[model samples]
Target: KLLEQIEKWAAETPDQTAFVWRDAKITYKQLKEDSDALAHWISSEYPDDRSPIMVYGHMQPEMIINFLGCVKAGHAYIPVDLSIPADRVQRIAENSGAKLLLSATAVTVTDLPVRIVSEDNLKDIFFTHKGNTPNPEHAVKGDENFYIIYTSPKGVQITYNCLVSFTKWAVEDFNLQTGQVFLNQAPFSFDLSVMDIYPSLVTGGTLWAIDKDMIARPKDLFASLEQSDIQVWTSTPSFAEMCLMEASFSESMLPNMKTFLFCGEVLPNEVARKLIERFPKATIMNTYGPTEATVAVTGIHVTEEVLDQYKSLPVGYCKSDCRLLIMKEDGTIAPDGEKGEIVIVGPSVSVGYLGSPELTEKAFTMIDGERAYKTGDAGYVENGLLFYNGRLDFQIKLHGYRMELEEIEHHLRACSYVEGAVIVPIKKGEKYDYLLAVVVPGEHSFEKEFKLTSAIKKELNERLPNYMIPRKFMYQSSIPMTPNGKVDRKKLLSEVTA
Candidate 1:
């Protein structure tokens, strides 16, 4: 089990650091002691209760401790980031029927039926119950919910088996080793953290957490990077691109850098190429999978050959334990090179969205007696490699012409003078009226910004039909990315309309 491995690491490397955040570092021994203490307290206090515990926090190491402690006490935890709105957090707490809310930071949640525990209380437990440990038999296992991660308005339940499956594959695939520095870029609320957190703990690696403030401040980000030796790099391509803007971000700055793991969005060709150029010794892996199917099921190392061969890089082959199925809209299997909805079938697939049977039933189903999830993403397979073609919902019909919003962005990105491109359609009542091409301009010989836009539009026209071109174009210094590091299309849509 994953917890068993974590226990092994604690015992074997008691003095080794498990996590590093700013000036503070927590050891393996301390992690075990603290989590075990909390687990003992929770299990003893609520012996009859099995409802999920809500853990609210940012990038604090206490978040990780709480996650382990909840499972140790045989209860699933609901991770709600501090950034999440108060109402949404309340909704998650109400919907998950969570009885306890453990917060790493002081939070204001009014009129909640659940008991709220603060960070100080968490520490007091460590000192109060020093020698206690939860019973092994009582630990969360099998099909029991391990964690309920809320996705916007809906909560997704990931079972112990699902986490173990994902961790097992991650540990093996990444070749995680003891005492390695695994950079934790995403917050606990985001599923992207799942790719780093458990795998690092299981393999006795230290998690280096980057808070939102550090991300907001470039000087602080570089300073933090300079202070630490980051070995296993994991982040969205958007974050990497932001870091790449600094000329000092290279092997010289992060000498111990080993792997560059990317997910959450499309790994743009320009970004991948820049990373490869900057860190020649590092291996870059671009992964693809929605939150429903763990962090990712398909991943490929971005090699020179892969970059040169395809215009849009392949997300790579499916993992050994999982199978990928491309299903047409008519419920038929899609042949090679045919675009269809991507379906994941494996142990890593989550049980379903918590308290959303209708939503869960629609997204998840059984196939060949195995649990499966229909990822709303559209993609195709070629030479056994899976390639993502944007979201199926991203396909929009304009003036009797069917086109992919991402397809336009793809061609827009292909243009030499465009850094990033996002197409937001102006809806007129029932249908899309026209598209607003919000673009980030790249370096060009053109003096005027309008001329640059025209040059890009002309280039795009050469690649796509006139109808596919945006009715209007707008340029920005850079595209806004979500907290999870994907291009913030929804936000951009509001901006254009406003």
Candidate 2:
């Protein structure tokens, strides 16, 4: 269904640019053509394999092409960003059983059975099958996995139906339009990017991508944004907060900017207030959902009235098809204003994580025989709006990256100098902004704590994403445990906040 939307635009606006990244552009026609050609090549070469194809890159247009090509060839595209360490990438590839890895930007992982398709190879494939269209019979449809995002230990499998349903709601609610410019902020590996990518394609809008380099250099970023003429602004609240640091980042800089879509992190009311103050004409829409629930299932426009009504902003009403319930520990649905875990039941909900039935079974369950996901997120319904409290589990959202604290601890324990590790998400302002690693030092020659910190960081840098690594390090001779003899994270949290 999403491809059909792209095909419509390709026919109607063949020459219109569908994506723009760092002065590079690709038209809707080319996006369609190359994707189909690649699809044809994939269908021919790997005729028997229907496993997900791994697309590795940052914010390149070919990344999108690779995404579409994989699906067109009846394969789910597993997005693996360039920021991911080679070790982790290898693990994800192995875990997902991805047979082919397509790298849009010149990067490769060793020690993998996955065949690599470089950018040069893709160009030749497209040229070899010029003017040829792939058979529509093999295109991914219905309950088949469209894209798999490895956001956590297990990759989330979003079906074609789930994507189409969510895309419809996003376009309808946000009032997306053809020829509008949608600013893409997050990496493809994360589901937050899905909020922008599909909408841009469905509406035939231009995708103005902000890559890692642009995000690093403020001068270049602002210059690029000034030229973007972006109408729909989609990003994590943390990303926006960074942009707000610059005085010129306002309505005057992007006069055409009409909508601000925030997701992937808790949008602090203060951040929303600042944006409102700066861009009075723009509509700020804050959304909330896990990657398993197809990008986002709940959203509300943060207008001046909304800010005035609540101390903390509400996450908004569930979309029309979804039923959001505040479920208690006793397994009963809680009443309004009663604090409990948030449970979402809807078509937008994905089947489950790939290759992990038990983990999937634990997180995703049934309500009235309808598939529902018990978001570890704790919240309550107040006045028909969902209010986010905090996570019920160790999973935390630090600066838009949702990660389980245990995952960090698991890797930290593997470090040579670390005896034991527990991840502490340090709270700043309203949301957790950074992570602090509490480590019990093992055998090490380092005389100072700073050197030990560096040593531990050097090891984690090889195994984890840059964002996943803790910002601060604390060394303790021993960790305090509970009466049951396990790491008392709650006890440590009390110490941190105090």
Candidate 3:
């Protein structure tokens, strides 16, 4: 009946385009019929008890078909970007225990013991299911695993059981409809794709997937915004900031953008102002969660005024299916207004990693008579809203004073020409780790040695204690990202320090 919902919508509105790519657009009728065909092919060829059918390739209409096919056939779907290194892909495959690999590109992936399916094969499958008996009962429903998306790390994936929960929440809360197009900027493996894929699909809304090449070019991005039907998007604060910094990003090009969604990192006040100015009527929602706590635990609709009042706005309280508890390092719940480890408990909470049992036990545990997923993020509550202070582990004791690395990075970003910044401490084997700030400046005009030390002394004298400032500052071209498209802090730290 789930597949039939799309089929019914298709029969009623056969000409409506469900998805749009470079020049190819698939109509509702075509999308439903094609997915059914692929589902039938998988049902006829493979057993039902197999793991997810992995889509390993670039973003395309056919890839979405395979994902729907796996969903309709009552199996999880895993998306692997072909751009990732072979070892990372293999690691994810091993972790997911997927039964098949469906490649959209014309490339060979050797050594993986899985049956290979391709775009040509999907076309063939589509033809085979055309004009055939519709399997209304065969389509998977809301009570099953929707997808398994891996973050930056290997052997770890977040599984979403019910896509409709998010869909229902979005439709009810955000008041989304078929006319509002969602942006597909995030990689398929990233958690942001949850809103991009399913919620849009179920609501019959059009989905526009921006390619990797276009992501790097602001001209291309502004062009896409002007041309495409997209009005809703979810991205990190950094990317949004980068776009807002561009001179051409204005109201005319992005007039249709009514909802700006951000998460995964801190949303800077300065960034929020530029965004709100570009789309003054738009509502910016900042979501918060780790990979372990479904895609999100809490979200807050923000405005420029809200950010101006507070240095950092609350990540918000829990969503419908989730709850949050700020806990201490010793596993005790902290009193209100005191910073502690943010713990989440709900149905959206995952069942831990595939092979890492020790981590599973340590991170996923019983807290306050319920299963809670430790977020490792440090935050506190003020007036019942959750405000993220910093990461518990990332807080370092530099110069006999406790300092939040994020705060240090904030100060660095406030510098006139700074583009992006990250703070990493240099650990000299058993001794106290020395402070180091890696910066990406917009212009090379900044005097690295002189400006950095002066900036530190200037900022520290007023805002921070003497020992809180970083001793060293390093400049870099760009920050490295993981396969899943998040700021790869590990890789960034490794590259600069090495």
Candidate with top lDDT is: 1
Best by TM-score: 1
Put down candidate 1 lDDT per residue, 1-498, tens digits, no spaces. Answer: 778889898889999899989987889998998899989999989988889999988878788888889999999988888778888887887899998989877877676778888978877887898889998887899999998887857778888888888888777776667678999988888999989888889889999988889888889999999777999999998789778878899998998898888999888887888888888989899888878888888889888988898788888889888898999987899999999999999888988998898999999999998889998989999877999988887788988998878778778888987877788988897888988898777777887877887888788889999988888889887778787777788899888999
Collision pairs in model 2: none
Q: Write the per-residue lDDT of candidate 2 for residues 384-465, one digit (tens) a residue.
A: 7888776777667766777766557657866787755678888777788888888777677898888999888999999888
Where does candidate 3 stray beyond 4 Å?
1-9, 141-143, 152-162, 355-359, 366-371, 415-419, 430-432, 440-457, 475-483
Query: Cα lDDT of model 3 overall?
Result: 0.70
TM-scores of the models, in the order given? 0.97, 0.80, 0.90
- Pick out the ten consecutive residues of candidate 3 with the lowest summed lDDT: 154-163
What are the lDDT figures for the candidates, one per model?
Answer: 0.86, 0.84, 0.70
In terms of lDDT, model 1 sits at: 0.86
* Residue 35 C-alpha lDDT in model 3: 78
**Model 3 Cα shift for residue 233 (angstroms):** 1.9
Please, what are the lDDT tens digits per residue for candidate 3 over residues 1-498? 435445665777678777777787787778877777777777777754647767887778777877877777766777777676777777777777787877666545666767777767767778978755335555555445566666545334344443444455655566566646787777776777666676677667777877777766667877876787568877777667656667767667767888887777887766676678777878888778776666666777786667767765677766777677888767578898988888888666766666677877878877566557887788887765888878887887764677677887776666656677777777776544777777766654545567755764575557656565667777766665554555668887787678
- Pairs with steric clashes in candidate 1: none
Backbone clash numbers for all candidates listed: 0, 0, 0
Q: What ranking of all candidate models by TM-score puts the best one first?
A: 1, 3, 2
